[PDB]
Amino acid sequence: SGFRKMAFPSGKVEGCMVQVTCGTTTLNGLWLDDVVYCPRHVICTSEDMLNPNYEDLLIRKSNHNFLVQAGNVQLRVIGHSMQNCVLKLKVDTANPKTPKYKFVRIQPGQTFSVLACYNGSPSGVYQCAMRPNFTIKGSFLNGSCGSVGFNIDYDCVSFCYMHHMELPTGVHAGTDLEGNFYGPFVDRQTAQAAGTDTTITVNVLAWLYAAVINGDRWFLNRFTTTLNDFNLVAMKYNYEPLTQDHVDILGPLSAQTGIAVLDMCASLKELLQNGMNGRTILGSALLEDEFTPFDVVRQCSG
Amino acid sequence: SGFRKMAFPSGKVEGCMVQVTCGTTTLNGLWLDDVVYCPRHVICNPNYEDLLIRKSNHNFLVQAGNVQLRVIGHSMQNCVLKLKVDTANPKTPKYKFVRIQPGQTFSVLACYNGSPSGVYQCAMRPNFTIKGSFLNGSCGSVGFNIDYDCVSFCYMHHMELPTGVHAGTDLEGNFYGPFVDRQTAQAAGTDTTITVNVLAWLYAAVINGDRWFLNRFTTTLNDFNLVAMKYNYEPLTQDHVDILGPLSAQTGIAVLDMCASLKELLQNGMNGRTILGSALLEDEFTPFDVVRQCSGVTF
Ligand SMILES: Cn1nccc1C(=O)N1Cc2ccc(Cl)cc2[C@H](C(=O)Nc2cncc3ccccc23)C1
Numbered sequence: 318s319g320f321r322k323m324a325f326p327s328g329k330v331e332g333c334m335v336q337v338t339c340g341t342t343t344l345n346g347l348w349l350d351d352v353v354y355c356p357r358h359v360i361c362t363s364e365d366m367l368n369p370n371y372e373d374l375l376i377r378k379s380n381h382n383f384l385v386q387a388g389n390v391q392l393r394v395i396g397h398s399m400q401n402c403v404l405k406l407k408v409d410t411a412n413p414k415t416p417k418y419k420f421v422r423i424q425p426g427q428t429f430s431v432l433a434c435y436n437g438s439p440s441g442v443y444q445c446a447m448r449p450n451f452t453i454k455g456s457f458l459n460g461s462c463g464s465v466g467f468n469i470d471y472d473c474v475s476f477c478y479m480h481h482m483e484l485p486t487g488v489h490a491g492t493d494l495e496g497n498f499y500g501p502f503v504d505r506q507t508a509q510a511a512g513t514d515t516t517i518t519v520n521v522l523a524w525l526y527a528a529v530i531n532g533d534r535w536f537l538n539r540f541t542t543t544l545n546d547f548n549l550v551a552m553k554y555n556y557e558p559l560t561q562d563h564v565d566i567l568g569p570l571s572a573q574t575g576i577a578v579l580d581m582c583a584s585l586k587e588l589l590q591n592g593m594n595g596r597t598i599l600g601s602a603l604l605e606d607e608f609t610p611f612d613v614v615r616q617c618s619g
Numbered sequence: 620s621g622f623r624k625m626a627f628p629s630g631k632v633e634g635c636m637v638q639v640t641c642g643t644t645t646l647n648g649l650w651l652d653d654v655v656y657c658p659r660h661v662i663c664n665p666n667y668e669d670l671l672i673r674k675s676n677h678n679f680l681v682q683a684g685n686v687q688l689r690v691i692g693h694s695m696q697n698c699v700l701k702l703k704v705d706t707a708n709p710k711t712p713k714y715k716f717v718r719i720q721p722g723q724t725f726s727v728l729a730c731y732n733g734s735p736s737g738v739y740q741c742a743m744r745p746n747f748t749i750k751g752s753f754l755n756g757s758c759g760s761v762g763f764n765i766d767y768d769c770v771s772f773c774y775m776h777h778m779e780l781p782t783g784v785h786a787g788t789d790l791e792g793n794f795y796g797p798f799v800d801r802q803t804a805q806a807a808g809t810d811t812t813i814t815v816n817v818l819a820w821l822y823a824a825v826i827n828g829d830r831w832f833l834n835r836f837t838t839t840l841n842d843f844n845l846v847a848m849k850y851n852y853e854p855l856t857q858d859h860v861d862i863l864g865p866l867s868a869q870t871g872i873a874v875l876d877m878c879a880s881l882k883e884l885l886q887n888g889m890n891g892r893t894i895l896g897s898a899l900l901e902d903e904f905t906p907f908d909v910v911r912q913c914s915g916v917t918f
Pocket residue numbers: 358366457458459460461462480481482483484485489503504505506620
């Protein structure tokens with residue numbers, strides 16, 4: 318019993334964190350085999366961030382301009398290339414602690430663990446979700462650039478995010494490990510803002526099924542709804558539209574609890590109308606949306 | 620910017636998790652140097668000296684990854700079983716066994732079959748239980764803090780109470796709370812809110828630009844403790860006030876000034892508003908957790 322926001326054990330990722338320095342900039346790198354991946358804005362000198370020409374800045378660099386530090390050991394850079402917004406530094410030593418890994422690009426609503434680092438040293442681990450507006454509500458301070466988001470599947474680490482920047486509302490933007498940004502963001506300190514955020518409906522439903530699995534049923538009702546009527550209601554509360562794929566994905570949880578997906582949708586509709594009336598669901602006074610259907614199955618059953 | 624419930628990096632602890640099997644029971648063990656520590660109920664009113672005397676070293680199957688460790692001795696210290704093994708753990712970090720006080724937080728590495736599956740942050744409740752997330756097989760999972768490079772082991776999971784909350788011991792086998800390691804009628808006492816932690820979380824909200832709850836008022840410590848007693852909040856001591864000093868100096872809001880904000884929040888509620896994305900007053904962040912997360916301390 319119990320339901321917590323749980324992160325993956327960070328050990329396999331900790332053994333990959335390095336510190337990357339170029340001139341006066343210091344950020345984090347991910348050392349996998351003989352390559353160190355880091356944000357390409359490590360080559361920028363702040364008054365470059367408005368309109369940086371990364372190809373022009375990178376052509377003026379040599380291998381010995383990049384100082385890479387893994388613990389108390391300096392790694393020697395023997396090559397460098399840019400792939401989208403990530404800089405790949407070829408090093409002379411392969412990481413002996415390299416786990417089994419993959420680079421995966423995730424979709425909004427997906428969750429992942431973040432190992433927050435400063436100066437190549439991990440300081441904390443937390444769980445979070447890719448928001449529908451492509452930002453993450455992280456906990457990052459200056460120097461956290463290059464911190465990574467991941468999931469662990471059996472013994473394989475799936476790298477899905479690299480931290481690049483903080484937007485004006487306090488939210489964060491970054492790229493997949495191939496350097497492609499999530500969202501319409503760019504590695505420039507130009508006027509950019511996160512779009513209006515919405516609630517991840519399929520995740521709230523998954524969390525309502527987890528509450529039922531843990532013995533809480535107060536919010537259920539005798540009603541059902543059509544998918545269309547549910548979306549008509551939910552959009553008025555800034556909830557993401559629920560698709561037939563979301564309904565299909567919730568099938569296992571529906572079969573385990575005996576509550577049809579559209580019956581649970583009627584309960585959610587009523588919760589949005591009434592609020593919680595002093596009650597909580599899994600120790601929360603708000604409807605939680607940072608647990609996917611997959612997270613619920615993994616934590617409530619295994 | 621941002622404020623998350625953050626756990627310590629679990630790597631130094633992952634390298635210590637082993638699977639312990641005795642008969643039909645399988646749980647987790649903590650392998651430090653040449654000793655494996657695990658709940659003594661793995662051998663299961665039970666007379667544990669009588670049950671343990673009937674066991675031999677080869678009855679305990681210890682598995683570290685895909686390698687079987689050979690047990691060469693065994694002894695009991697309170698509610699923890701100590702299994703002497705032939706191989707010292709090469710991944711043993713610098714460590715200490717520490718006993719924590721209620722209100723103090725720690726990271727939990729939840730494990731099943733000697734394999735770590737998740738890490739989460741939680742607090743020792745005033746009623747000595749933890750609101751964890753555990754299933755059958757979690758027994759022997761450990762709670763810890765990391766101080767520089769030293770891991771401080773403070774908790775070992777033993778059981779789940781009827782309300783869904785958890786009970787365990789320190790690494791010396793002494794239970795937190797009036798609990799016993801057996802199948803009997805026991806229940807968690809009435810819980811209370813950790814006041815010093817709520818205040819720390821209100822200071823973290825101010826640091827992140829959330830000031831709506833602030834007011835021009837102050838209060839005496841005595842007048843505030845009468846309010847705390849009425850709302851099932853733990854009494855706030857002069858030590859708690861002293862501990863909050865750095866946060867008070869950083870934000871410019873005196874501790875008793877923040878107590879007046881909490882008093883108004885307790886008597887009037889949040890009125891549709893949230894603080895750090897929460898509609899409830901959060902109490903599982905200590906004053907030190909707030910300073911550490913709002914400064915970027917590494918391990
Ligand atoms: C935040 N900001 N708003 C205007 C100017 C800045 C600013 O400090 N930076 C500008 C900037 C622009 C584009 C890119 Cl790709 C990176 C950056 C850097 C950045 O965003 N770094 C940070 C990354 N993550 C959490 C941070 C928290 C607190 C400070 C900094 C953080 C530097």
